Amino acid sequence: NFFVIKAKENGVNVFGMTRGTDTRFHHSEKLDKGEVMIAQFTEHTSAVKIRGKAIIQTSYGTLDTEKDNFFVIKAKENGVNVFGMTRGTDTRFHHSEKLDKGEVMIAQFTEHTSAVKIRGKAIIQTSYGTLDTE
Amino acid sequence: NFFVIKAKENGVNVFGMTRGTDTRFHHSEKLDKGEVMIAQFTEHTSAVKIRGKAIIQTSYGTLDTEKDNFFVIKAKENGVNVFGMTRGTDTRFHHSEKLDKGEVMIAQFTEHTSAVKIRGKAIIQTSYGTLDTE
Amino acid sequence: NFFVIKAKENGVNVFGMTRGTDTRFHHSEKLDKGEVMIAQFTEHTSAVKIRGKAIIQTSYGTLDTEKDNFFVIKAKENGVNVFGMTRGTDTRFHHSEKLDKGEVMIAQFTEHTSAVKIRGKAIIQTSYGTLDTE
Amino acid sequence: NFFVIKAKENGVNVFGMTRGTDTRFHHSEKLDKGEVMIAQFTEHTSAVKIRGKAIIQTSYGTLDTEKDNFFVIKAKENGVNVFGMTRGTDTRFHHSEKLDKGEVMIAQFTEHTSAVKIRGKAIIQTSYGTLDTE
Amino acid sequence: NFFVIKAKENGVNVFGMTRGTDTRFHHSEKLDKGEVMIAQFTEHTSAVKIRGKAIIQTSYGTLDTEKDNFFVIKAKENGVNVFGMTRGTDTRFHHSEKLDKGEVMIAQFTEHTSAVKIRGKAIIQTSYGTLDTE
Amino acid sequence: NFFVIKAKENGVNVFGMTRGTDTRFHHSEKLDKGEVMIAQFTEHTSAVKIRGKAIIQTSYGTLDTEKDNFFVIKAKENGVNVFGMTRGTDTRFHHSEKLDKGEVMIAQFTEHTSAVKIRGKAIIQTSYGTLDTE
């Protein structure tokens, strides 16, 4: 599948997360005002972290960064965190991702992870609908 | 497929059942108030047992723990039990699962089981609709 | 595919027919009042015979035993019979199944049978709709 | 796919045509009043000829013998004929089938035939709709 | 896929074009008044040229010869021509087909051709809709 | 998939871009007034550049050159540019395409490119809807 982004300012950033349990950012894009980005989910990148004033658009609908298979998360407040399961018999929440207010995250479901856990107040969108932490 | 859970309290628990006739719980999660969980059905886990005050959401609709392919069961009362068939020529109800009032169960259909039998008063949801024991 | 049953009394029975031309019953279930059953069609069982006061539910709709791919039959009266073709060049109606008033039958289409013939007054449901013998 | 027939009298007949250019009838069924028949299209039988007072029902709708992929033909009058093409470079109308008023024909599309031609007044039904010779 | 034709006169003709860049007519059918034809698109025939007073019917709708994947063309006037691309690196319009007023053409997309060009005034129908040269 | 073009003048041009990171134009078509073109996306051509007064029609709708999976771009003004990502670990915007006011571009998603970036004011259409740079 694919997604669409639009920039409301200069400096809107994109971080690509390495696919797998070992997670780190390999890119730091910079988008000027009026930018529009189109991209896929690849074997190298199963998730994307968006930053800055931007508009994100996907199959589940259109999301705004400022307004108060795969899945969507929008951080309503600061300190928002996320956790990931390790597939297989060895079971534990491997990582504790972190996000700030207004940050957005998107990720597919990988052979390395079968479940996810979230912390902080945030909005969630899926192929089934939407879900708010409050 | 996938499912979504939301926690209304602290201590909402998740038990993963080992896939196959040999059934036992390999995990005991703990969810605080405001938790949200997303997970898949895996070769290691064909069924899930949910416990505590929570909201469960699936393709068949949205279910509440307190309000009075794969399938869904919601225990309306205490003493609710479930049974499973053994696939193949050797035919008999192998186990007698047990559930309490307000407990929820979800399970795929496995190569080890072709049919299921339920006891106690409960609610059932499927790709076809819903069914109440009363 | 799958089907759902509900019991209105004690003693609702289920007979599984051996897949193939050689047909006989390998099981005789007993369902108490309030029972609910879920099962698949398997290589070992291509058809099922239901007996007793029960409610049957499938993709073609919901059927009642008392009210006056695969296919559905409901015996409106006693003496209802069914016949099966033998696939291949050797062509003849191999068997003459029998059913009583209120009895229900369900069966897939197998490599052993390509056509079926019915006798007695009965109701039929398919992926296309419903059909009454009268 | 499949089809359904219902008999309005005794002696409703079914002829199965051998699949391929070499066409002849291998069966002559007899249906009493109130009969109902269900059958498939098989490698041995790509077409079926129906005779007598009967009701035929398919994905394209419900047809009556008396009222004035695969395809459907209903003979409105006597002398109705049909012709078949031979697939491959060798091209010619191999046969000239014949039908009487009220007769019905059904046939799949085979590796031996790519096109068909009809004569007499008749009604035609397809996955696209219906067509009358008049 | 398939198509349907109906004849409004005697002498309605059908020309089958050889599949590939080398195009010539291998057949010249003759249809009397009231004829109805059904045929497929085959490896031997990727396109068909229709001539005479007839009614053509396809998934894109119903067309009349007199009224003023694959694709459809209807010649509104005389001198209508069509051209075909040669697939691969070697690129040029290989042929210049010709059609008269009221003539109709149908063709699949082949490994030999990836694009087509038309000349004269004509009507076009596709899986997307219709298009008129005027 | 496919697309349709119509010419409003003489000299409407088509440029085919070589599939892959190495991009250059292999063809320069000329379309007279009233032209209509149909073509596919091929292994040799993953994108097409349209020039001149023309009407373009695709699954996402109908576009006009003058009015003020794969994707669509319409240059609203002069100086419009586009950029492409290089798939794999080696990550950078390889090229900076350029377009003038009224120019249109169409391209599939290739194994060589996973994302694209645009510059200038333009209109975008996708399987999800439309997007304007303003």
Swiss-Prot record, chains A, B, C, D, E, F:
- Name the source's superkingdom: Bacteria
Q: List the SUPFAM superfamilies.
A: TRAP-like (SSF51219)
GO molecular function: any one?
RNA binding
Q: Which UniProt keywords apply?
A: RNA-binding, Transcription, Transcription regulation
Which BP terms does GO give this entry? DNA-templated transcription termination; regulation of DNA-templated transcription
Entry annotated with the keyword rRNA-binding: no
* Assembly description: Oligomer of 11 identical subunits arranged in doughnut-like structure.
* Protein family: Belongs to the MtrB family.
> Function, please?
Required for transcription attenuation control in the Trp operon. This trans-acting factor seems to recognize a 10 bases nucleotide sequence in the Trp leader transcript causing transcription termination. Binds the leader RNA only in presence of L-tryptophan.
| Name listed for the protein in its UniProt record | Transcription attenuation protein MtrB
Name the source organism.
Halalkalibacterium halodurans (strain ATCC BAA-125 / DSM 18197 / FERM 7344 / JCM 9153 / C-125) (Bacillus halodurans)
- Could you tell me the gene encoding this protein? mtrB
